[PDB]
mmCIF file of C-alpha atoms in Angstrom:
data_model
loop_
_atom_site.group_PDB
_atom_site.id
_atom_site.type_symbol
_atom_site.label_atom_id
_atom_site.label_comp_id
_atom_site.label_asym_id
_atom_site.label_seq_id
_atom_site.Cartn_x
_atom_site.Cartn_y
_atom_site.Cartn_z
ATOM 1 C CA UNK A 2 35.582 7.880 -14.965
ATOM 2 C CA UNK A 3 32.411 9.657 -14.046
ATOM 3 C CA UNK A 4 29.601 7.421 -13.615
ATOM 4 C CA UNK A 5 26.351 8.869 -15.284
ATOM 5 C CA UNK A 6 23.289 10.510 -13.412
ATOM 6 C CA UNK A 7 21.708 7.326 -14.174
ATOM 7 C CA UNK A 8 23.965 5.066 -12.861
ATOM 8 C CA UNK A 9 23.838 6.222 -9.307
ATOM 9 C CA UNK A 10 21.794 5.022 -6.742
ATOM 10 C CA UNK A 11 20.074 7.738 -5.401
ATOM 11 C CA UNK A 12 18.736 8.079 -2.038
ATOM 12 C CA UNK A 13 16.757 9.672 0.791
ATOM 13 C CA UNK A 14 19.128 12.957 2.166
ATOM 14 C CA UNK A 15 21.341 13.297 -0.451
ATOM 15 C CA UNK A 16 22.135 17.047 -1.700
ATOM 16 C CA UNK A 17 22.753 17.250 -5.648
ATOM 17 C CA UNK A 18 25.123 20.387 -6.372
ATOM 18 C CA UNK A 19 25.565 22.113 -9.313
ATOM 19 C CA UNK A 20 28.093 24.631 -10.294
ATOM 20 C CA UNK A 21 27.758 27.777 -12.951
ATOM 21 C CA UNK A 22 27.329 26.295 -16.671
ATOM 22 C CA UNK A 23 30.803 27.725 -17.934
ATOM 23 C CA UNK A 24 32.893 27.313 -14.460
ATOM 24 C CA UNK A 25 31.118 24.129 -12.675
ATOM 25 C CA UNK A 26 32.486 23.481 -9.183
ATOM 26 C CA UNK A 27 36.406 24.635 -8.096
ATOM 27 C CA UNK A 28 38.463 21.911 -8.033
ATOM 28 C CA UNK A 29 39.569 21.944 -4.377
ATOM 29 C CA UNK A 30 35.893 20.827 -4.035
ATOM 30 C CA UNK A 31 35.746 18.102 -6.327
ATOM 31 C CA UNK A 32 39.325 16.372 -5.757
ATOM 32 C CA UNK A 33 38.269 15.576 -2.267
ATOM 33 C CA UNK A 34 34.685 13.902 -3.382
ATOM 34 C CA UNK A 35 34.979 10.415 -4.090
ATOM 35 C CA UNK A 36 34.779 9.214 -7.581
ATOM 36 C CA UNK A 37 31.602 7.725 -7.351
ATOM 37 C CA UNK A 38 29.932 10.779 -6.103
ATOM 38 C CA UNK A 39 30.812 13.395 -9.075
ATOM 39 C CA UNK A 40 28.168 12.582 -11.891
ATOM 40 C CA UNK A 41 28.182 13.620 -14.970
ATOM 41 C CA UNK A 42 25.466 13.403 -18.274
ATOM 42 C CA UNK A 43 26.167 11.937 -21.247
ATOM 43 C CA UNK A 44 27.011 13.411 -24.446
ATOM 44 C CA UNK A 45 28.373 12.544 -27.536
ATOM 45 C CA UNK A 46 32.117 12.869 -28.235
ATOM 46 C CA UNK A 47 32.350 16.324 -29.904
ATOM 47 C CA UNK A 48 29.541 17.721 -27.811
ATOM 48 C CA UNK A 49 29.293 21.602 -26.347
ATOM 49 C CA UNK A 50 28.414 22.707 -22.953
ATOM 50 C CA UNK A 51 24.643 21.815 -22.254
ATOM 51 C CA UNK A 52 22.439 24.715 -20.650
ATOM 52 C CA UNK A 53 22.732 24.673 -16.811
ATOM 53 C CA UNK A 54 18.904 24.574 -16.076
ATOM 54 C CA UNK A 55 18.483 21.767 -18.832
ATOM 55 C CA UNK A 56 21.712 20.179 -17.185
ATOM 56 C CA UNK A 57 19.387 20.287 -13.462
ATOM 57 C CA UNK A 58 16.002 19.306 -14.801
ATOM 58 C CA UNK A 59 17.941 16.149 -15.891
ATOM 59 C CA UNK A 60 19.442 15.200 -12.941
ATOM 60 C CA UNK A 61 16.088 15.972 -11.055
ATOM 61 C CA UNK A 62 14.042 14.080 -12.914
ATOM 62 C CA UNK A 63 16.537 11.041 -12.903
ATOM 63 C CA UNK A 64 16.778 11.394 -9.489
ATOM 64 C CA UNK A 65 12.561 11.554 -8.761
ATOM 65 C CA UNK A 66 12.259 8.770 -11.069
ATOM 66 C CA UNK A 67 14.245 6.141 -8.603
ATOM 67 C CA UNK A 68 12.375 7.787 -5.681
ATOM 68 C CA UNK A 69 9.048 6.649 -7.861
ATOM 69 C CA UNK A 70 8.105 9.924 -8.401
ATOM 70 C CA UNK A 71 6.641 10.232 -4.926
ATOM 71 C CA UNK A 72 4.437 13.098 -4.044
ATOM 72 C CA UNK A 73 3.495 13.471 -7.897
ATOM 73 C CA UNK A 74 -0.442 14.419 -8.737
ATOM 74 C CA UNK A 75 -2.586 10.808 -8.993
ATOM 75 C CA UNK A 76 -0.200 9.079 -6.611
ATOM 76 C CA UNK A 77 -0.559 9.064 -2.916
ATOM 77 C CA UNK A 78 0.053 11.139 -0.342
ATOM 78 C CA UNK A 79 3.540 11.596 1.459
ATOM 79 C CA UNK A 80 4.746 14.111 3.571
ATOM 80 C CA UNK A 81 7.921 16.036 3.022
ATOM 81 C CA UNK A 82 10.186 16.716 0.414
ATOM 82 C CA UNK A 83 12.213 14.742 -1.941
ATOM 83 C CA UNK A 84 15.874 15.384 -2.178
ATOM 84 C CA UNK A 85 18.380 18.784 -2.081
ATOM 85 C CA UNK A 86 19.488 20.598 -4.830
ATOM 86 C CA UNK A 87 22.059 23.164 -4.315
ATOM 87 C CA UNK A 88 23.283 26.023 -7.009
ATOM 88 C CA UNK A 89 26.650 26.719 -6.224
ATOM 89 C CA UNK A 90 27.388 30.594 -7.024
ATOM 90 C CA UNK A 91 24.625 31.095 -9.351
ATOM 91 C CA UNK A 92 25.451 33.444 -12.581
ATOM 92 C CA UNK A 93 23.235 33.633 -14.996
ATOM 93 C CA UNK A 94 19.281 34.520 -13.189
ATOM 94 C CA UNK A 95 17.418 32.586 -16.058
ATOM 95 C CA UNK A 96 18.634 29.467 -14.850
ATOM 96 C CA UNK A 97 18.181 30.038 -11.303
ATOM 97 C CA UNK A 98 14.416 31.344 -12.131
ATOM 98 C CA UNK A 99 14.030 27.793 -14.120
ATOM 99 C CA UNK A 100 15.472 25.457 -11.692
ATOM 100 C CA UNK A 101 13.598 27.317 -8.867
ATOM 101 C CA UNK A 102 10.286 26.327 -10.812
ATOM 102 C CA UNK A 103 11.504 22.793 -11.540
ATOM 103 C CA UNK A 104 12.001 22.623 -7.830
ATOM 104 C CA UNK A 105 8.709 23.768 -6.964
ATOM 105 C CA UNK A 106 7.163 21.025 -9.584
ATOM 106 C CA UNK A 107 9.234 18.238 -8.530
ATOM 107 C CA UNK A 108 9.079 19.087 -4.374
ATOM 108 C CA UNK A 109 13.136 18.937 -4.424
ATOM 109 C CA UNK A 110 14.229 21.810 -2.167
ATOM 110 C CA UNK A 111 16.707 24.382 -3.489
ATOM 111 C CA UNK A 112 19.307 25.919 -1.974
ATOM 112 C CA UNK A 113 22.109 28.614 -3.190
ATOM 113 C CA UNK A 114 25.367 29.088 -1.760
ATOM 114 C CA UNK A 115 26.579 32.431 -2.336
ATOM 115 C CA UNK A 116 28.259 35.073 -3.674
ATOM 116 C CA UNK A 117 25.177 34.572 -6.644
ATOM 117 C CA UNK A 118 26.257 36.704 -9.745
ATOM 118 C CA UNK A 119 23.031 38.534 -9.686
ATOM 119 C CA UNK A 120 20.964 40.444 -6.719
ATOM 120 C CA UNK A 121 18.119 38.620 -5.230
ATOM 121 C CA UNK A 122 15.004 40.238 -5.918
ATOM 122 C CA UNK A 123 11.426 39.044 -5.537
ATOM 123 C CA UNK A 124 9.857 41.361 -8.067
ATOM 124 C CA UNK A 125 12.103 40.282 -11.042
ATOM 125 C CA UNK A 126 11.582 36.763 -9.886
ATOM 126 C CA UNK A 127 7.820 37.972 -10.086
ATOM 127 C CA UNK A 128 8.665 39.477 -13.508
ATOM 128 C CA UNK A 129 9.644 35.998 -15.156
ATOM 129 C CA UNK A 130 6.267 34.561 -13.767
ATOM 130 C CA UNK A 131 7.505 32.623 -10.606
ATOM 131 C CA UNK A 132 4.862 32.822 -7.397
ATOM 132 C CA UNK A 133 6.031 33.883 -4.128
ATOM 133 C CA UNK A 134 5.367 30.618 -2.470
ATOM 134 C CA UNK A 135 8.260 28.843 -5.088
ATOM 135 C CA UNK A 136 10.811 30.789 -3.595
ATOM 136 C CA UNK A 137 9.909 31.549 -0.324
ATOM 137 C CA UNK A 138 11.281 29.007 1.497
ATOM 138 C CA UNK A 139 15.086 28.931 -0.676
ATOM 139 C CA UNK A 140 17.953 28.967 1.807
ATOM 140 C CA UNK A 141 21.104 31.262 1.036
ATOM 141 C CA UNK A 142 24.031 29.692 2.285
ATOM 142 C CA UNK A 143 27.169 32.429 3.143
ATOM 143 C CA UNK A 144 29.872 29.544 1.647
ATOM 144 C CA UNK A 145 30.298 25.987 0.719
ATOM 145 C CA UNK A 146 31.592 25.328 4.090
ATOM 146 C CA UNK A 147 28.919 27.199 6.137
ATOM 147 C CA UNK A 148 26.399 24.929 3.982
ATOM 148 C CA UNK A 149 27.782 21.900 5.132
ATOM 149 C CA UNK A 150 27.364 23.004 8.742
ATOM 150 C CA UNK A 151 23.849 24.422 8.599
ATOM 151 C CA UNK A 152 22.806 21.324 5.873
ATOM 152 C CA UNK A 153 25.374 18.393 7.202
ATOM 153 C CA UNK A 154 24.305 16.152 4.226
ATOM 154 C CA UNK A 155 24.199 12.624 4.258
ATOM 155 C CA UNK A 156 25.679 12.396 0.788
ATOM 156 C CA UNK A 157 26.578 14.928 -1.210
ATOM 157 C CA UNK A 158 26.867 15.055 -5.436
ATOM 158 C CA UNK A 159 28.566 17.075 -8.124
ATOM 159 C CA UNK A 160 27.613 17.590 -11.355
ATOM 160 C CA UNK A 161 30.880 17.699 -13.513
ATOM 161 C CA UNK A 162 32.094 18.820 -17.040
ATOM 162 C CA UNK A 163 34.425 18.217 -19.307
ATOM 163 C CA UNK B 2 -4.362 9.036 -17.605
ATOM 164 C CA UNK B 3 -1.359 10.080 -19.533
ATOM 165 C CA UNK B 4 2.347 7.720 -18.615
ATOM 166 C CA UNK B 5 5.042 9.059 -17.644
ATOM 167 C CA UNK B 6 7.981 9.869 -20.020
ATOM 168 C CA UNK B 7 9.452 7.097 -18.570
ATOM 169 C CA UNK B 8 6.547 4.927 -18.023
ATOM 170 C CA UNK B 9 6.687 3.981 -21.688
ATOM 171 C CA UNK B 10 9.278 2.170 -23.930
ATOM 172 C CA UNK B 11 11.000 3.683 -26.435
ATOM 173 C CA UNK B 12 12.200 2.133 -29.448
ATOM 174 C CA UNK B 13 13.944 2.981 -32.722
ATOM 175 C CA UNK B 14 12.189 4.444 -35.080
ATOM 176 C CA UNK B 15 10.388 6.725 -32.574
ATOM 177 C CA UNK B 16 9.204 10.376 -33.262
ATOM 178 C CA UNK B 17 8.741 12.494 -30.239
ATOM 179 C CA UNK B 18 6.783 15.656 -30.139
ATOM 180 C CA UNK B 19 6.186 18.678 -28.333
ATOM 181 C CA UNK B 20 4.549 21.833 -29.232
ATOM 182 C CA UNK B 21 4.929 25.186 -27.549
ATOM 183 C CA UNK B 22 5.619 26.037 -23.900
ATOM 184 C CA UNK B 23 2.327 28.316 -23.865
ATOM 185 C CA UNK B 24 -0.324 26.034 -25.522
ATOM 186 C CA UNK B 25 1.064 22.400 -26.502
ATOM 187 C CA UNK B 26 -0.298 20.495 -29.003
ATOM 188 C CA UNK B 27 -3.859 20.207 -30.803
ATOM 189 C CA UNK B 28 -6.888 18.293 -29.579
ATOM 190 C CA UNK B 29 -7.084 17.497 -33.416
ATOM 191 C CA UNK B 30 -4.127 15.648 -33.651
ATOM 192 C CA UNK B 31 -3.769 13.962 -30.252
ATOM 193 C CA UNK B 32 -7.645 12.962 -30.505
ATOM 194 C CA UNK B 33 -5.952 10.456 -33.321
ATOM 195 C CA UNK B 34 -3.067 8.979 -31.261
ATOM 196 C CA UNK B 35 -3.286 6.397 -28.780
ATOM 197 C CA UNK B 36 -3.174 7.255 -25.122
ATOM 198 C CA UNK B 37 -0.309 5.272 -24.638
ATOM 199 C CA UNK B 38 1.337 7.394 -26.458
ATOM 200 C CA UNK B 39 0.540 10.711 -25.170
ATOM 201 C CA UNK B 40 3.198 11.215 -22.237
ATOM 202 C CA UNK B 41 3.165 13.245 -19.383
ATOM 203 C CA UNK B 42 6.109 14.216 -17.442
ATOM 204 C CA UNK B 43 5.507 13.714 -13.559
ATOM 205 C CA UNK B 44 4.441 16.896 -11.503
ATOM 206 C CA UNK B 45 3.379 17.783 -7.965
ATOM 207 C CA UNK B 46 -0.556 18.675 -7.863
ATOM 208 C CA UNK B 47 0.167 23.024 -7.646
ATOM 209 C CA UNK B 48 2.861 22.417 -10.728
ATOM 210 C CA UNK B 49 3.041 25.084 -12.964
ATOM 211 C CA UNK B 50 4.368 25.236 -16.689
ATOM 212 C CA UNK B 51 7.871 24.069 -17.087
ATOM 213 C CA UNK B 52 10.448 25.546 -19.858
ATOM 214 C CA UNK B 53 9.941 23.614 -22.778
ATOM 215 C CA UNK B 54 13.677 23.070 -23.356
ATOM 216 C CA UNK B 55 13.640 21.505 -20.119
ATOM 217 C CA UNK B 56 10.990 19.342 -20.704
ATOM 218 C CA UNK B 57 12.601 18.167 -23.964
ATOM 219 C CA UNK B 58 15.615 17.912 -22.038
ATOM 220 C CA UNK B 59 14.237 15.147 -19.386
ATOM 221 C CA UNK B 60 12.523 13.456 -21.930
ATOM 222 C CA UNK B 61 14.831 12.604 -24.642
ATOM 223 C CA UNK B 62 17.942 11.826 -21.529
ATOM 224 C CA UNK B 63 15.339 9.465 -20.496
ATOM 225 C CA UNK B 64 15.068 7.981 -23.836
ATOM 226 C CA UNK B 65 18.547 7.856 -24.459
ATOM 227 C CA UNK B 66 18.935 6.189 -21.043
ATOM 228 C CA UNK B 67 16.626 3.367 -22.038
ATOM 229 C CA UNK B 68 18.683 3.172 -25.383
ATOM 230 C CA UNK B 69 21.656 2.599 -23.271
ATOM 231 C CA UNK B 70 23.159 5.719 -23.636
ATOM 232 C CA UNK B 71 24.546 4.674 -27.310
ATOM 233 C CA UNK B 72 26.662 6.559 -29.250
ATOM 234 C CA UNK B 73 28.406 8.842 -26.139
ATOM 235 C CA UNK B 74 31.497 9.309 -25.406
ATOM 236 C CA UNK B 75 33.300 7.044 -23.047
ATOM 237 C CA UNK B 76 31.410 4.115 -25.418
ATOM 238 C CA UNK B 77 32.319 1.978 -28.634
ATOM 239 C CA UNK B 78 31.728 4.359 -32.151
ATOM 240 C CA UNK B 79 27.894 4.051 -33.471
ATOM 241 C CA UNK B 80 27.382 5.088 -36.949
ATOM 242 C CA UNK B 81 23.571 5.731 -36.526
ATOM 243 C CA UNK B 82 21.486 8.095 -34.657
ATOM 244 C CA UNK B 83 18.689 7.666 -32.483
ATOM 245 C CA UNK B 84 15.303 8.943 -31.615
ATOM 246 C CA UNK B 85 13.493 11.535 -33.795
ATOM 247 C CA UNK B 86 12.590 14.775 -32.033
ATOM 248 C CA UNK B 87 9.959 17.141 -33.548
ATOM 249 C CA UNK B 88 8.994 20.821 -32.424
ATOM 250 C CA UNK B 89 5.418 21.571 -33.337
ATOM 251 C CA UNK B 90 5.264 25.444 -34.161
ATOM 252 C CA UNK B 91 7.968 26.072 -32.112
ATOM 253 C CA UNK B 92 7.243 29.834 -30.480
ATOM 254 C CA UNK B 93 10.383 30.775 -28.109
ATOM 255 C CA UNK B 94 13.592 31.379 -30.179
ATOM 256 C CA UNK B 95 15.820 30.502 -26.834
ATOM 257 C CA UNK B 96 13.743 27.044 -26.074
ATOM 258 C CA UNK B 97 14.701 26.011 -30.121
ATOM 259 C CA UNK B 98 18.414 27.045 -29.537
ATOM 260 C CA UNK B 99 18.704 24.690 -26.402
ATOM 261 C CA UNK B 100 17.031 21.683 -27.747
ATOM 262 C CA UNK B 101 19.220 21.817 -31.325
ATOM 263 C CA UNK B 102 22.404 22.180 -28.611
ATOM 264 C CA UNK B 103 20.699 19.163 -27.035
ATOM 265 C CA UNK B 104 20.053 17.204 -29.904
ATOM 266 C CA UNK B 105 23.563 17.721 -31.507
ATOM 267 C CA UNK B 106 24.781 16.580 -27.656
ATOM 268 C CA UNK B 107 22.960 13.124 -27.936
ATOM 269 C CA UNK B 108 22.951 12.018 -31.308
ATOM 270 C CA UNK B 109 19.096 12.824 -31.829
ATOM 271 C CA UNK B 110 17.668 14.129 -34.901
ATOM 272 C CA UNK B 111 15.594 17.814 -34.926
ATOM 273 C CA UNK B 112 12.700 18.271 -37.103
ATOM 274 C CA UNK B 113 10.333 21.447 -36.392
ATOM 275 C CA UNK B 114 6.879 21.714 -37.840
ATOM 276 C CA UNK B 115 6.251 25.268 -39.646
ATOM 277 C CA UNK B 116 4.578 28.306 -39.062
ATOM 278 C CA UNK B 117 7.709 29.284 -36.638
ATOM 279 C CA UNK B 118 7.204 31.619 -34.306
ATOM 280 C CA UNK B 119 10.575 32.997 -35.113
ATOM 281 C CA UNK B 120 13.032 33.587 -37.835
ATOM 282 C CA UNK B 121 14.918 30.859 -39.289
ATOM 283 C CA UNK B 122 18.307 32.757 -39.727
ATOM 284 C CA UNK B 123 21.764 31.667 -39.511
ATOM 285 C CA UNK B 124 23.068 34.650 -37.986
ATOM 286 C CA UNK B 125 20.656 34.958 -35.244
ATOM 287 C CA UNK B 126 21.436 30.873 -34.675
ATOM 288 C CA UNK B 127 25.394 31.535 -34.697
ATOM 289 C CA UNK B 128 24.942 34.551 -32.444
ATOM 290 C CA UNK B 129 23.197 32.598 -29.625
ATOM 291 C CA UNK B 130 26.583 30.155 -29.423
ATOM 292 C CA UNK B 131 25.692 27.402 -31.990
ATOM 293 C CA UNK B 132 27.766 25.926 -34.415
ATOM 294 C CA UNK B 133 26.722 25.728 -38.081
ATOM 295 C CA UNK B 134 26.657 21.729 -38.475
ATOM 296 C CA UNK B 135 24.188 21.786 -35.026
ATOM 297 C CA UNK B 136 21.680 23.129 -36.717
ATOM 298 C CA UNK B 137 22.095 22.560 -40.689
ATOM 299 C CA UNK B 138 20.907 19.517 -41.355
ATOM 300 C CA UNK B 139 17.648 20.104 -39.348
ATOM 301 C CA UNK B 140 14.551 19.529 -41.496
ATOM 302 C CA UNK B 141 11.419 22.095 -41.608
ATOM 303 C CA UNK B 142 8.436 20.756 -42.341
ATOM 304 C CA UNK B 143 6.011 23.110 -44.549
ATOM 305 C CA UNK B 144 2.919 21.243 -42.131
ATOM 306 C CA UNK B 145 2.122 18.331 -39.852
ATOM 307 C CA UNK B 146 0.554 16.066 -42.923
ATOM 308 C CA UNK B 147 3.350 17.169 -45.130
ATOM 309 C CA UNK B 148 5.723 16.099 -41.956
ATOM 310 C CA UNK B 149 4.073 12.620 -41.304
ATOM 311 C CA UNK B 150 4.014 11.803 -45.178
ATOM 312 C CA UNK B 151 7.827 12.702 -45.322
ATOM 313 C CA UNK B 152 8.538 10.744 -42.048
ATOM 314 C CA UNK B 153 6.347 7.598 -42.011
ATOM 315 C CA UNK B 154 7.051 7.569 -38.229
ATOM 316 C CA UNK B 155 6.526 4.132 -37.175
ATOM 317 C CA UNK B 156 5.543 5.556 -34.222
ATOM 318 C CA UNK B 157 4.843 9.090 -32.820
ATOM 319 C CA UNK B 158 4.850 10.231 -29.375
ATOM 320 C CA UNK B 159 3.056 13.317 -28.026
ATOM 321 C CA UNK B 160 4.084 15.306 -24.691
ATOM 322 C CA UNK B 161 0.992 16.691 -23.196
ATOM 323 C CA UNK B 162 0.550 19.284 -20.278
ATOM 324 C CA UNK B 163 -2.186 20.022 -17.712
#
């Protein structure tokens, strides 16, 4: 079974993806990961599909916790980023508007592999109150496949649902 | 300065609370709480406000995590629930649909703290995608005395912002 998001061990280089909140990640992806690498949160037994951004923040958080919260305010100084987050085909633009803010907070860098189910555009990221400089820097990947090749990460995670 | 979310130790019998996304919770009342108490989730030093469902999010998975996860799915039946969670003058209708989805997910109890920001209405609850026994049983509280003489929290926590 899935080990939680807690009860990996996460590490320097690793990429954390995520797939859209109804379809998560196609199979053919996932049935070549090894076990240990697809993560997913607990919930109760008769539980409903968690929101996507909620489902990310989670995982982040977890993740910056075990890295010891480096590069938060009132600790010292370190260079560079923490880990990779990566939003495979991206539906719904409130979530990717969240999670690029939560990436911004946290120093995780995001990344989207497309086709996204919305059009990229600065001034309705504007709109929902995001600053340029949050995502400025957020890579679009063409596919899964041409991520791996510009990104070659040293591990890489799935979020799964049931 | 204010610990982490998961710089303290949760217990049962916990309360945790969080006001609104856009102003947080009175000096009044956190004045009367101790600092240890007061919890602050981890940011980098430009951080800007984070959705309050996602806040809630990382904070009660963290508790949960620290309660073992108890009471999910791929674990022996528990016939209690855990922590408390308490929205003070919740303002966002969306952030209050997520965190009763949440709570219903983890086994955590909802309270919110009246004047609402929004209608309390079935129909506008159903029609964002919850079921009626997620959000039935939640308790409103007609003020914050009225809700700490109903509760008797044995102890309450308080998320702060910058």
């Amino acid at each position: 079974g899935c080990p939680a998001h807690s009860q990996v061990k996460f590490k320097l280089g690793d990429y954390l993806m995520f797939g859209p909140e109804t379809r998560g990640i196609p199979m053919s992806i996932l049935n070549e990961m090894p076990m240990e690498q697809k993560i997913r949160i607990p919930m109760t037994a008769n539980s409903r599909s968690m929101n996507l951004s909620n489902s990310v923040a989670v995982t982040v958080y977890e993740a910056w916790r075990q890295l010891g919260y480096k590069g938060a305010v009132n600790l010292p100084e370190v260079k560079g980023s923490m880990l990779d987050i990566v939003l495979y085909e991206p539906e719904i633009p409130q979530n990717t508007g969240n999670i690029i803010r939560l990436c911004a907070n946290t120093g995780f860098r995001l990344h989207l592999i497309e086709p996204l189910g919305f059009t990229w555009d600065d001034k309705r990221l504007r709109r929902s109150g995001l600053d340029y400089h949050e995502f400025a820097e957020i890579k679009r990947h063409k596919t899964f496949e041409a991520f791996l090749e510009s990104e070659k990460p040293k591990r890489l995670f799935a979020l799964t649902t049931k």
